[PDB]
Amino acid sequence: HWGYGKHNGPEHWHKDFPIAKGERQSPVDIDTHTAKYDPSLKPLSVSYDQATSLRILNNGHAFNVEFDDSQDKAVLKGGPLDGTYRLIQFHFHWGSLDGQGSEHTVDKKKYAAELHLVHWNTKYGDFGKAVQQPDGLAVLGIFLKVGSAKPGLQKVVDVLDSIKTKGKSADFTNFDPRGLLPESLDYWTYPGSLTTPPLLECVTWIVLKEPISVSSEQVLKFRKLNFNGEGEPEELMVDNWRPAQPLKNRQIKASF
Ligand SMILES: NCCOCCOCCNC(=O)c1ccc(S(N)(=O)=O)cc1
Ligand SMILES: [Hg+2]
Ligand SMILES: [Zn+2]
């Protein structure tokens, strides 16, 4: 199936998922001079004090930190959104080298990684239903730059040992997502899609202007993960990011 290899990479995904050449994919290049400053955009509302992390799982394309979304525990509201969006999971996309890894690019600039905080619109009742609506999902994207260590990321880094290969999971409770947010909530927003198959066009993307900094050693441990299942030939989990897609007359709005 789909992957990020030469034979099953992004370039091939259209074959199984024709929406791949759709009108609102994901990721895109953020052109800061063409982005439109929208004064009607309200500030983002991130209420994660009550977040309840449960487990960490290697799914073969990344590692996801799953949260209990049975209730309005950790929510996203404000910004360009209408209603409440519940945090279901968070994951990252990283490179084999520091010069690459992010999905979205700013003025053609690529970052070392990109953190995606996935939220689904509660009016739709469940995650599955939300993926059937054009305003179904909201993804909060955060750029990661190599520099100083990120204290709040270490807990995650340390458990990676445990979920080295595809299919492995580990209990991962009492993780506070708040530790991953930058100081500023200034963002860019546009209508897009999931960046991995099924590439469903149901996402309201919110990309934060300010990157968080992580240490070289932190990023390094990400690169130690495997694409493969245990007992299979080792294939390092690096470069799990999709190239920029055509904006196609879509407009990128800026909150600043
Ligand atoms: N019944 C419909 C099922 O809907 C299928 C949805 O796919 C589920 C798995 N994928 C995700 O949840 C998912 C979530 C976020 C992103 S991304 N990379 O755009 O943030 C990519 C993928
Ligand atoms: Hg959709
Ligand atoms: Zn993602």
Determine whether the shortest distance from the Cβ of 198 to ligand 1 is under 6 A.
yes
Fold of 1-256: Carbonic Anhydrase II (3.10.200)
DSSP per residue over 34-79, as a string? Answer: TSEE-TTPPPEEEE-TT--EEEEEE-SS-EEEEE--SSSSSEEEET
- The single residue of 33, 61, 104, 119 carrying the catalytic annotation is 61
**Rounded distance, CA 159 to CA 240, Å?**
20
Residue 194, φ and ψ in degrees, nearest 5 = -70, 145
Asked about 33 being catalytic, the answer comes back as no
In the numeric block, which tokens belong to residue 95? 């490179």
Q: How far is CA 209 from CA 32, 133, 203, in A?
A: 10, 27, 18
Contact residues for 158 (Cβ-Cβ < 8 A; gap 6+): none
- Ranges of each domain in the chain: 1-256
**Rounded distance, CA 50 to CA 86, Å?**
12
**Rounded distance, CA 18 to CA 80, Å?**
28
- Annotation-wise, does 116 bind a ligand? yes
Q: According to the entry, how was the structure determined?
A: X-ray
- Do 202 and 25 contact (CB within 8 A), yes or no? no
The residue nearest atom 11 of ligand 1, judged by CA position, is 194
Which residue reads 């493969």 in tokens? Answer: 228
- Do 44 and 209 contact (CB within 8 A), yes or no? no
**Distance between terminal CA atoms of the chain?**
41
Q: What is the resolution of this structure in A?
A: 1.9
Single-letter amino acid code for the residue at 76? L
- Annotation-wise, does 104 bind a ligand? no
**Rounded distance, CA 217 to CA 101, Å?**
15
